[PDB]
Amino acid sequence: DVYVPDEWEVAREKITMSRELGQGSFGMVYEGVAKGVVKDEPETRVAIKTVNEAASMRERIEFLNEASVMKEFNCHHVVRLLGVVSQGQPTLVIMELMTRGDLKSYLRSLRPEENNPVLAPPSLSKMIQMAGEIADGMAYLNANKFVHRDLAARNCMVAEDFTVKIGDFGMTRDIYETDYYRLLPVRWMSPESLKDGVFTTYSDVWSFGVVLWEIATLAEQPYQGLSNEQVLRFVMEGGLLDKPDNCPDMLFELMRMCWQYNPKMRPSFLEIISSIKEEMEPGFREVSFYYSEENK
């Protein structure tokens, strides 16, 4: 209850709303341009989250406080919060623009459609690059004392230059209702989370393993031939996802490491990056949390 304006407050005149991106939790999200949000840059392509005209003051306050969690993060592999327009209406939250949408949407767009030629499935190098970027964003969140609880391809975003980042929170779907069971994302959950409802960085690692499986299958439904109730029993009884068709053993071995029944036996996000750092683009050493002074 109640929102206090801070240093993140940006004047309304600096914001220009253009094309629609999609429906958000509190209202329509638009793309556009912003002045003075990235230092003194006069024109930065941004994503603008809005609150619907018919919403109450409680809903506007809820939107601002929920979005304010992003203020604590400064990572190249996590979607950035750039500004907040709380003074007057429409209520706005300025975000970093990710032109290629969510990773699940991007992976499904790569699937072959009839007769016309198609691009070959993403190469191991391209899959490892995505893996290291997701793991870096997650290693940053864990170091900042956060547990994601909903790590999935649908909750990862793809930038113009194809860089994958940890997406904005609660901005999931609205076309992925099937990925949840009543509330909880059962097909992405660790055996311990399905048992006691407790989530840790170890359960986030389990979910990361499922993200790798999504990349290798081009966002197929995990445990496809099983219902939500069957998934619960299968995973809790020690069941695992099958090795995807044409998936290199190197990528599947990493999935198996994430899928260890004992949460303490799973590798950390830092341990995951360490095993694949040699395969990352040279630029990773300059932009990642892994190589920054913050990782100590």
Ligand SMILES: C[C@@]1(C(=O)Nc2ccc(F)nc2)CCCN1c1nc(Nc2cc(C3CC3)n[nH]2)c2cccn2n1
């Ligand atoms: C606007 C919205 C979104 O916020 N997606 C989304 C999904 C998961 C996640 F983790 N973060 C954002 C809602 C549903 C569709 N969508 C979206 N967003 C895009 N881009 C986008 C969203 C954001 C944060 C402001 C929210 N930055 N950039 C985008 C590019 C191409 C298609 N889309 N579609």
